[PDB]
Symmetry: D2
Subunit: 328 residues, 4 copies
């Protein structure tokens, strides 16, 4: 053979930094291209239930291999293809229509997770689970209960995107890059999210100390419209292009980088909140977490104003109202 | 104002970007080009143009929302070409795309008509830009953009066979158990059915695969390496059949070309350019040959030493393209 | 000729993203490798007065070109080599010995700047001047006076590194990546620098709000020692390895990135502060600045406590006293 | 404590992609900075015998942590700091001197390896060893013999740099980026290196097909002078700046990238050549190897002309002559 004329084999194949993306819809493929372009993995595996679509997506990424540093890209409906993953990203399930809450996807997606989650853990016992499908906070709780994994290893993309949207809008109003505009959107990745105005700052300068009316209806510059734009973002983009993909793709690759490179950066992501802010139930929602190689190792206790804390508890209550009725 | 309480302004800046890129067409190809360029930190400004207002705004917003994770501080869009002003590079990914089983050549009149509106609008706002054609049939549309723009030929580049060659190197890599970066091989001529695999130049570590197998790429080849070129030709049709279109690979291929232009690299790429004066071609035919690509576009052409059969295939590719090119109404 | 047999020339220029580094000592070379590895420039020029050392450094960088994306690396004792730079980085001059203040370097470095500055500005109409040599704040005032440039174009590396050191040390104490530890060291890049305790935070949570005694002598955890370690850092590193290079090289490449990519990120860098905190003279020192393609376009007005403001005015008085010793 | 007031700890720490650099001279520190800037490791360990120098270098790197994505930088004279390294890079020993062959360092470097190698293997028995110390080809054989490792895990940086230098020089003559100028320099990383003119090409076009006398004495354009410049490069750089560092650091980081990311790229690096080109002894020298996570898995069999083969056998004979009389 030509290969044997050209190459003398001297050694008789396990990946060290494998990532799996489950679900090849627009979200899944945006996560895949973003991870591929951040050189986070030595192996990328894709999984879906639509055979042709799955093979087409895999081939299209494979054909870009010359321009990447991920030497193996594979796919299958069979979960054996996901074996030995360090990180498994779940982007499978129904997505919200225009005028539909992420909360309305819960029954369809819990039922899908009942199949996906045990199959993922069967082949990747050392992985961290990164939940992206909606409603993310409830689905992170669901994946945790199903997986048998400790809670540090089951992470929801949560408010990492809401916070990036908030920082972009703030940056645009101020003429400062989003990197230098600090601001946290916490709670549900959805309608009941909480903008933490008390912590909004540039170079440690509290914007609320300069303008006490910040984020209230009495604010002359209406900064509450910034949070409203954050809440409405997915709806607005869905109305315009039919779905969202790029921003969530980059937000998930951001979380994947902190995990794969054990950075211990702080992210507002879905985790168990029981024990904080008087929350007594197994509610999962976004709070700033330290994220690394073992997932969520620590939770930051944000000092919230009385109104911010009440809003966060109201967000926990909304999530509990849906979660408490789940059968799985 | 809160901005004023927080910040003292020192001066009113010119605000003209220094590394601006425009992507015309926000379909799946255009958006894959946009994301790949954003993730490669090639531009200080990204502008998007299309004729579908809602889809254009939705795409711009979705990229903008990921700004925190990027290093491109301004992302804008409009149906109006004033949004594209002062672009260093303008990437054209607008027009009809191949349906399942459709030749890229079938898109020619629909895309020439669209180019009649697009090209003058681009040139009006960025008279010094490099034009990078991605729309199909790429080779003929690079000729069309060249003629319409009035630009010198160095500033009108077609993505050509950069992707075909990347597909060839991936497939070769898979057969040899080597990364595609260490597998060398060139696919020339039309970015389509008449492309030419240059078997005589296919190598790993400078070892000619044809020197080990003299029947390489022929019908008499026991390993049927010609099937690698057939897979290259069929790739887009196969991906279209499975997912409905192609995007990732062309997006990565366009960003690779954008990188050589924006960073004045002077790397060699098989891209669409005028081949008149080479291989006995007497006409203004545009097709892929290896070109040195930099800040001024195509500054030089590599003269590939083709075998008589390879040269015959390249002239056949030239004949097919010229047949359509010579009769264009614009 | 073989080149003409292989290549048909089709076209008959000017660099678009050129950077010059003046000084090929350990600092200058650390800036050069950091800039090369960050893909910030299409051309890199080096300038020094020692012919052999300069040529040797240029050649060693050129030999790594295959692994880089900067296609032209050049050098000369003649400033015509720096023509058409967008950014000129000054790392020339005497360095402090153990037990020697950076302020003691003033007369030697001013004399050198009287030659370098007019020669640099002559060939690059669009350049920003980035001063690294010490005392950086004083030398930024000096480069500003000699060049006749507007203040937005004359920047001192200032406290960008002091703040990076502060954030690293804070990160170590908290088990958090420095990227998620926020805190500002302002004023002189030296002994009189000011840690802005009021702005020190993780996820928008003020550390001073949790420990009102933070940074004071009454602090049980002695966070003031973190600022003392920042002040002493260069001297500790000098005593150990003889000089410092890597951290400053990275700090300067971070500033070069904001400039070259027009990021508009906020950095604590040397600029004129006349008109803020009761300062009435042309004092240069570090304050949070928005940095982009036109240099410093905007200054953030940090809200300081009376004690922090008094420490910042003390630093300004120190620097102004040295400025009064300058002979142009 | 402030940390406990701020953060709720949920989880009480082994690196997954650790690299150790042994030797903190100019070569070692250039490897370290290049590896840090390429985001190849989650932990970097430094080892040397000069305690102050070692601590100063580690601190200087640590201070730039905010600008990097390698969260743990550690050092010690004690090899326990190197535990669980995936890759251990040896840069220690006597360095090439002005007007002196790299072969002049052999005995002293063999003696040093008798200490280093058992210490490295004790703490990371499954690492890949990357030898950079000179004479690299003989020291790779030495490291292989002392370590007891299988030959795939003992790699010499070999001719990866000589080939990068060759491609830079070819690129300058042709007006093409070195990435698009292909050519291999094999054999000894030193005076007896072999330029493979038969494989030298641009876009698959053999330069020898355009100039049959390419690289010979009869070559009208005297391309042999390019290989002479490759051979002389370290002697010239040493004469000018005292040592070489930047290019070798980038060449080593290029090899570290292929190992750490399992790229299976082809590199001209030091491996056992017994059984090829009539070589019957345990000689190590550069031939094009496939490099990945298990080190050298395969060797490309280059079709050398009779001239090129005789030149490679001579390089093998020069190395065996020295190696034969070692004792260890
Ligand atoms: C995150 C937004 N949602 C999407 O992008 N959804 C489209 C992709 C998708 O749902 N794939 C998929 C994959 C696996 C799978 N296993 C089952 C038992 S059903 C199923 C469905
Ligand atoms: C390359 C594959 N083609 C696609 O991705 N096509 C979809 C996007 C597209 O065609 N946009 C667009 C943009 C401008 C424009 N100007 C006109 C007069 S028509 C027109 C259409
Ligand atoms: C910041 C730490 N300082 C250093 O790294 N200094 C060493 C490098 C150095 O001083 N170069 C240099 C360059 C130009 C020049 N022009 C003159 C009239 S004197 C002179 C000296
Ligand atoms: C490649 C050029 N060589 C250099 O840069 N060398 C300087 C650094 C150096 O030799 N370190 C060092 C480290 C460990 C060690 N263990 C021993 C028993 S001796 C010894 C010496």
């Amino acid at each position: 053979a030509l290969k044997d004329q050209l190459i003398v084999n001297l050694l008789k194949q396990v990946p060290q930094n494998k990532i799996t993306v489950v679900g090849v819809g627009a979200v899944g493929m945006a996560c895949a291209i973003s991870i591929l372009m951040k050189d986070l993995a030595d192996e990328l595996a894709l999984v879906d239930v639509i055979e042709d679509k799955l093979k087409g997506e895999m081939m299209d990424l494979q054909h870009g291999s010359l321009f990447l540093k991920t030497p193996k890209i594979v796919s299958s409906k069979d979960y054996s293809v996901t074996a030995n993953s360090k990180l498994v990203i779940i982007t499978a399930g129904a997505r919200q229509q225009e005028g539909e809450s992420r909360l309305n996807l819960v029954q369809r997606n819990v039922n899908i997770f009942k199949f996906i989650i045990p199959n993922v853990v069967k082949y990747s016992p050392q992985c961290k689970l990164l939940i992206v499908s909606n409603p993310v906070d409830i689905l992170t709780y669901v994946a945790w209960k199903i997986s048998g994994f400790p809670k540090n290893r089951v992470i929801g993309s949560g408010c990492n995107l809401d916070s990036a949207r908030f920082r972009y809008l703030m940056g645009e109003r101020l003429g400062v890059h989003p990197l230098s505009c600090h601001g946290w959107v916490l709670g549900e990745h959805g309608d009941s999210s909480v903008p933490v105005w008390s912590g909004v700052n540039v170079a440690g300068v509290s914007l609320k100390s300069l303008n006490p009316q910040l984020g209230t209806d009495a604010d002359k510059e209406q900064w509450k419209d910034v949070h409203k734009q954050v809440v409405d973002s997915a709806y607005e983009v869905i109305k315009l292009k039919g779905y969202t993909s790029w921003a969530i793709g980059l937000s998930v690759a951001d979380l994947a980088e902190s995990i794969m490179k054990n950075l211990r950066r702080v992210h507002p992501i879905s985790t168990m909140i029981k024990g904080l802010y008087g929350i007594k139930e197994d509610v999962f929602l976004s709070v700033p977490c330290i994220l690394g190689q073992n997932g969520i190792s620590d939770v930051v206790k944000v000092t919230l104003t009385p109104d911010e804390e009440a809003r966060l508890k109201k967000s926990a209550d909304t999530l509990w109202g849906i979660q408490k009725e789940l059968q799985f």
